[PDB]
Write a protein that binds this ligand. Structure first.
Ligand code: HEM
Length: 441
């Protein structure tokens, strides 16, 4: 019948908060999930949410007629900077559907074919960097993947060159971002520099570059493109929010993906061997064609399996549109919040079998077999990732070229250490790459 909701122990007015005293809250919540099962309530001073981990409950939560996207505490801080951009707007905010309609054509297959050459530009810069390292040198994986993904969104979206590969520290734009992503995550564990405004020069420079300057990219649609429903273009204030949104969303999760993918490949030599052999076979030309990337079937499986284990945007939040009952057992009142613990969803033994921790790309051999709402690294419904096909094309292309051009060594026997900034990264992951001395075009 009507069930009492599991909940970890509460400590007076502190509630459950002393159980999340960590820089790694998602990983801590995964342990609580292992303990309490498919749903638990979590209270902190003043606020309450319910963590879901099973495909059966999340499939219900994914019913857009009953639950909509909620801005979690973390997203409410990002909203200070990203405003009512796509990622930090409520669905019922006018600018949400408006920008969605305006910007969606920028991710059509075709706009995607139109991005490929610029993707290859940044990818060649990555490969050339690693070709040019001396014998005594190693690669800082997440740091270089971030150089690539930031430059890729810069160039494809905004025809702006961040020139991240001409810098040996992260781009100044990144360095701001990283501090605000962590401080928003830390502000949650507070029961009782963040203001220091840096990226607005960058935004000005992106718009001004375009002002001067034959482009048909994301920025063009932001600037000119009007919403078929209402006839309205985006206003200036919202355009600035969208630029910021796409610069942060357009690079951070993709970089984490590539990093985890390389991690899992160097830990699984037989998977690496097969992935490498596909890359050599398919990529027969000096630089990859759009069509060839689509032929990298096993590399795509490798990426989906990295997202299964460590989805780089690991949670999303929902709220009950009306009073409702969840799972036929848990009554919810209007406004009650739910969080989808994606890494936990992706370990549901009832869906995946009981080797959920193993890195097996062949799970994705025939994807239509995978139940609905079992695999959700890109979110849900109308508020799902708009950039999904962009991210996967970029990553497939890049991983393909890496595997074609180098042999990789896990030279420090790296121990996985996952840093959380509301995206996930394998912090400190380093490798050595031995060139196969295949020329570029
Ligand atoms: C593997 C890489 C990526 C992952 C795992 C990922 C994941 C996600 C997830 C889980 C959401 C839903 C957020 C929520 O429900 O609160 C989302 C939304 C969003 N993502 Fe992605 N993302 C990736 C790459 C990208 C890229 C490359 C772009 C842009 C080029 C992008 C742009 C966006 C935008 C604008 C939204 C808000 C969409 C809306 O609500 O209308 N993402 N993403």
């Amino acid at each position: 019948t009507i069930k009492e909701m599991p909940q970890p122990k509460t400590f007076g007015e502190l509630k459950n908060l002393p159980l999340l005293n960590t820089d790694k809250p998602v990983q801590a919540l995964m342990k609580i999930a292992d303990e309490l099962g498919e749903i638990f309530k979590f209270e902190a001073p003043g606020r309450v949410t319910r963590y879901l981990s099973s495909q059966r409950l999340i499939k219900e939560a994914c019913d857009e007629s009953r639950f909509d996207k909620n801005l979690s505490q973390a997203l409410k801080f990002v909203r200070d900077f990203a405003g009512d951009g796509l990622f930090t707007s409520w669905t019922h905010e006018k600018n949400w559907k408006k920008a969605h309609n305006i910007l969606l054509p920028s991710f059509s297959q075709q706009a995607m074919k139109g991005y490929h050459a610029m993707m290859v530009d940044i990818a060649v810069q990555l490969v050339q960097k690693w070709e040019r390292l001396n014998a005594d040198e190693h690669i800082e994986v997440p740091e270089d993947m971030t150089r690539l993904t930031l430059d890729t969104i810069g160039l494809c979206g905004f025809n702006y060159r961040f020139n991240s590969f001409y810098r040996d520290q992260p781009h100044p734009f990144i360095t701001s971002m990283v501090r605000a992503l962590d401080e928003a995550m830390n502000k949650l564990q507070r029961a009782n520099q963040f203001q220091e405004k840096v990226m607005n020069d960058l935004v000005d420079k992106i718009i001004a570059d375009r002002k001067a300057s034959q482009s048909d990219d994301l920025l063009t649609h932001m600037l000119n493109g009007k919403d078929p429903e209402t006839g309205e273009p985006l206003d200036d204030e919202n355009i600035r929010y969208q630029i910021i949104t796409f610069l942060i969303q357009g690079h951070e999760t993709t970089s984490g993906l590539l990093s985890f993918a390389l991690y899992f490949l160097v830990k699984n030599p037989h998977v690496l061997q097969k992935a490498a052999e596909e890359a050599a076979r398919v990529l027969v030309d000096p630089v990859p064609s759009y069509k060839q990337v689509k032929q990298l079937k096993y590399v795509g499986m490798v990426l989906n399996e990295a997202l299964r284990l460590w989805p780089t945007a690991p949670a999303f939040s929902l709220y009950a549109k009306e009073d409702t009952v969840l799972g036929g057992e848990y009554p919810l009142e209007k406004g009650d919040e739910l969080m989808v613990l994606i890494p936990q969803l992706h370990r549901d033994k009832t869906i995946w079998g009981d080797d959920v921790e193993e890195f097996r790309p062949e799970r994705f051999e025939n994807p239509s077999a995978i139940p609905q709402h079992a695999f959700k690294p890109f979110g849900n419904g109308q508020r799902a990732c708009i950039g999904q096909q962009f991210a996967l094309h970029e990553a497939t292309l890049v991983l393909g070229m890496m595997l074609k051009h180098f042999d990789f060594e896990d030279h420090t026997n790296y121990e996985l250490d996952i840093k959380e900034t509301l995206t996930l990264k394998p912090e400190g992951f380093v490798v050595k790459a031995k060139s196969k001395k295949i020329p570029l075009g």
